[PDB]
């Protein structure tokens, strides 16, 4: 297993305010089902993306997904654990901040997950029931694949 | 008065070894090659050729100081594949590539004149 979040998002915006980065665009996405707001920075020339694109986003602690730590190292000879390669676009980063709506006595009902993918950021807002798997300073893999 | 002679970029006087092999203790199966009296002409070639090897995990070259004529090449390979063997294979690969390129270029030159 080793899965943290699985959903299909809808690209509603690309350039809300303006374009600040040539090779990197910001995806403002809304989710089906869980109703999970998403903001994500995606390399453009490497992985083109347009408005109204069905893409399946997966958050995973490890790529192997059989339940073993990846020790955070890049080795091209790592084929033998049968890496999850069903996705076109794969990122790697860490959670740097998790915000919430809790106020003293009351618990948080909506959480925001902030992940830095080595410089590219994503914000993920939604109900805490499915977002509690995120922990600060924890390694995260982003998996991306367009849908028809 | 402090200008070094012209033959300090390629010539080896007594004492220097052309290539020096030092192991790297920081990571397994990594080596450091120190090539004396050489420049980017050989270092970039070696770096590019080594990256073609699927068994090479790390490969690169550097000049510690341009006023000195030295190259440090660091090669890291997968287990059961010595980096020295990788360097030897890269050099032999380059020999074959250069011989084949010269052969084809000579054929093309001969074809161009009266052809």
């Amino acid at each position: 297993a080793g899965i943290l979040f699985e959903d299909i998002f809808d690209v509603k915006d690309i350039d809300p305010e303006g374009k600040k980065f040539d090779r990197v665009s910001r995806l403002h996405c809304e989710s089906e089902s869980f109703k999970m707001d998403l903001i994500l920075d995606v390399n453009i020339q490497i992985y083109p993306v347009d408005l109204g694109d069905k893409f399946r986003l997966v958050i995973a602690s490890t790529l192997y997904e059989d339940g073993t730590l990846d020790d955070g190292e890049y080795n091209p000879t790592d084929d033998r654990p049968s890496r999850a390669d069903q996705f076109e676009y794969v990122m790697y980063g860490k959670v740097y901040r998790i915000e919430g709506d809790e106020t003293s006595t009351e618990a948080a009902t909506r959480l925001s997950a902030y992940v830095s993918y080595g410089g590219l950021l994503m914000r993920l807002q939604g109900d805490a029931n499915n977002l509690h798997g995120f922990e600060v300073d924890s390694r995260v893999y982003l998996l991306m694949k367009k849908l028809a | 008065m402090n200008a070094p002679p012209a033959f300090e970029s390629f010539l080896l006087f007594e004492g220097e070894k052309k290539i020096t092999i030092n192991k790297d203790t920081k990571v397994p199966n990594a080596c450091l090659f120190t090539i004396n009296k050489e420049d980017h002409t050989l270092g970039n070639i070696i770096k590019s050729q080594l990256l073609k090897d699927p068994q090479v995990l790390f490969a690169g070259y550097k000049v510690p100081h341009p006023l000195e004529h030295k190259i440090i090449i660091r090669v890291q390979t997968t287990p059961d594949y010595s980096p020295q063997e990788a360097f030897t294979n890269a050099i032999t690969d380059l020999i074959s590539e250069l011989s084949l390129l010269e052969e084809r270029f000579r054929v093309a030159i001969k074809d161009k004149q009266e052809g």
Partner: protein, 97 residues
């Protein structure tokens, strides 16, 4: 009002304590009157320090020069020990005092 809201350590709520402090320490804080008395003494001393600061620093200039950066070092302690803000702490406030 904000000074008290931020520095009083109101233990009467009994629900915020369960969320910020560990469940074991909440009963110790609430039951023992010595804990509450020492915490109120700490707050009174901090109020006296606030009055001293307001005497020392008119014009309300909070930028001061001090040897060790307490905020950065607290943040370093958070990162070194993998402190999770989302979870209640085991740190007893009287041990802090």
């Amino acid at each position: 009002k904000a000074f008290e809201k931020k520095f009083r350590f109101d233990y009467t709520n009994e629900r915020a304590l369960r969320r910020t402090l560990q469940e074991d320490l909440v009963k110790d804080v609430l039951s023992n009157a010595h804990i509450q008395n020492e915490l109120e003494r700490e707050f009174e001393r901090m109020r006296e320090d606030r009055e001293v600061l307001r005497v020392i620093f008119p014009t309300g200039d909070s930028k001061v020069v001090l040897p060790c950066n307490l905020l950065r070092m607290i943040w370093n302690a958070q990162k070194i020990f993998h402190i999770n803000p989302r979870l209640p702490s085991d740190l007893h406030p009287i041990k802090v005092v």
